[PDB]
Amino acid sequence: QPTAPKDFSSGFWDFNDGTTQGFGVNPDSPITAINVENANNALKISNLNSKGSNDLSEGNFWANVRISADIWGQSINIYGDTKLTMDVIAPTPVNVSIAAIPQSSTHGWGNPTRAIRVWTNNFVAQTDGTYKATLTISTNDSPNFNTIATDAADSVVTNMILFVGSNSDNISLDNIKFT
Ligand SMILES: OC[C@H]1O[C@@H](O[C@H]2[C@H](O)[C@@H](O)[C@H](O[C@H]3[C@H](O)[C@@H](O)[C@H](O[C@H]4[C@H](O)[C@@H](O)[C@H](O)O[C@@H]4CO)O[C@@H]3CO)O[C@@H]2CO)[C@H](O)[C@@H](O)[C@@H]1O
Ligand SMILES: [Ca+2]
């Protein structure tokens, strides 16, 4: 049930248009019974723990669910960029593991070198009641990200795959952007 973006004028995924802005379970995901929807102007990913998408290690993110913006219909020039950052939102401080594989027309895949984790102690309470952590993926963590960001001949991200793991059946991603 992924839904195309209605407004991507910010140049990054802010999920403020009520859509999953192209995101949904990836065809090659080992896990599929994961819910991906828009809630509270964010990308809400439910049941990660119940479906075994809870690997929190650095190199076994292969066991986690893979999501991708297959019906995104947009793109982002990332030449010269060095980071992929996003806010992880949850009602209580949880643990979330994220590995990413940005894709371009000529650089379709690269095995992530490592997944980046934010642990409970990384979450800060928000006045809205929820807790939020800032997760950042460097080009050092994703070779395909480094390849695209350093390839002036083809530095346009046309899609992306995220490996998402958590010990919480309720987390949200928001403001996923390259900088
Ligand atoms: O073709 C246009 C279409 O492409 C979509 O992207 C595809 C990639 O093109 C495709 O290469 C990629 O395939 C992955 C596959 O999903 C992985 O599961 C698999 O992983 C391998 C790993 O590479 C090996 O090193 C390791 O030893 O084993 C694992 C599995 O055992 O690797 C292949 C790549 O070789 O899948 C993408 C989609 O999931 C774009 O997303 C889309 O936008 C384009 O339209
Ligand atoms: Ca938002």
Side-chain angles (χ1 to χ4, degrees), residues 1 6 37 73 93 107 123 127 134 157 164-165 175:
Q1 52 189 63
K6 282 193 170 301
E37 58 190 2
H107 306 310
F123 286 72
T127 60
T134 307
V157 173
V164 194
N175 301 307

Side-chain angles (χ1 to χ4, degrees), residues 13-16 40-42 173-175:
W13 287 274
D14 52 48
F15 304 108
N16 298 327
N40 301 296
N41 291 307
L173 298 182
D174 192 34
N175 301 307

Side-chain angles (χ1 to χ4, degrees), residues 114-176:
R114 74 173 60 69
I116 299 297
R117 281 64 54 63
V118 288
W119 309 87
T120 41
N121 65 76
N122 288 309
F123 286 72
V124 180
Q126 302 305 109
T127 60
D128 85 294
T130 71
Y131 294 73
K132 183 191 66 169
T134 307
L135 192 158
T136 299
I137 287 164
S138 152
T139 46
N140 296 326
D141 311 311
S142 185
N144 208 47
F145 176 19
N146 187 57
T147 296
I148 299 167
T150 59
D151 181 19
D154 174 31
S155 50
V156 183
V157 173
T158 43
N159 198 350
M160 179 167 60
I161 300 166
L162 299 176
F163 295 69
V164 194
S166 176
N167 67 315
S168 184
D169 281 352
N170 170 43
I171 72 164
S172 277
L173 298 182
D174 192 34
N175 301 307
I176 303 172

Side-chain angles (χ1 to χ4, degrees), residues 16-159:
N16 298 327
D17 58 10
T19 74
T20 68
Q21 288 193 135
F23 274 107
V25 178
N26 178 80
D28 302 314
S29 180
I31 301 167
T32 55
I34 290 295
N35 181 53
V36 186
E37 58 190 2
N38 180 310
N40 301 296
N41 291 307
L43 184 66
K44 184 168 182 290
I45 312 181
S46 304
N47 308 316
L48 290 172
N49 197 194
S50 293
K51 268 62 220 307
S53 190
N54 45 28
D55 191 281
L56 302 183
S57 81
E58 192 187 71
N60 194 43
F61 51 79
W62 296 102
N64 297 314
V65 70
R66 304 180 184 187
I67 66 174
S68 48
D70 291 331
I71 54 177
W72 178 33
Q74 309 276 168
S75 73
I76 297 164
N77 176 10
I78 65 162
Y79 187 67
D81 276 0
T82 59
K83 312 181 184 313
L84 175 65
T85 68
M86 65 198 83
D87 297 326
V88 186
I89 292 67
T92 319
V94 297
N95 302 304
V96 180
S97 167
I98 302 287
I101 300 181
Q103 298 180 301
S104 67
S105 70
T106 74
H107 306 310
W109 183 276
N111 297 326
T113 62
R114 74 173 60 69
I116 299 297
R117 281 64 54 63
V118 288
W119 309 87
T120 41
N121 65 76
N122 288 309
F123 286 72
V124 180
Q126 302 305 109
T127 60
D128 85 294
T130 71
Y131 294 73
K132 183 191 66 169
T134 307
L135 192 158
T136 299
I137 287 164
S138 152
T139 46
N140 296 326
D141 311 311
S142 185
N144 208 47
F145 176 19
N146 187 57
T147 296
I148 299 167
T150 59
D151 181 19
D154 174 31
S155 50
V156 183
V157 173
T158 43
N159 198 350

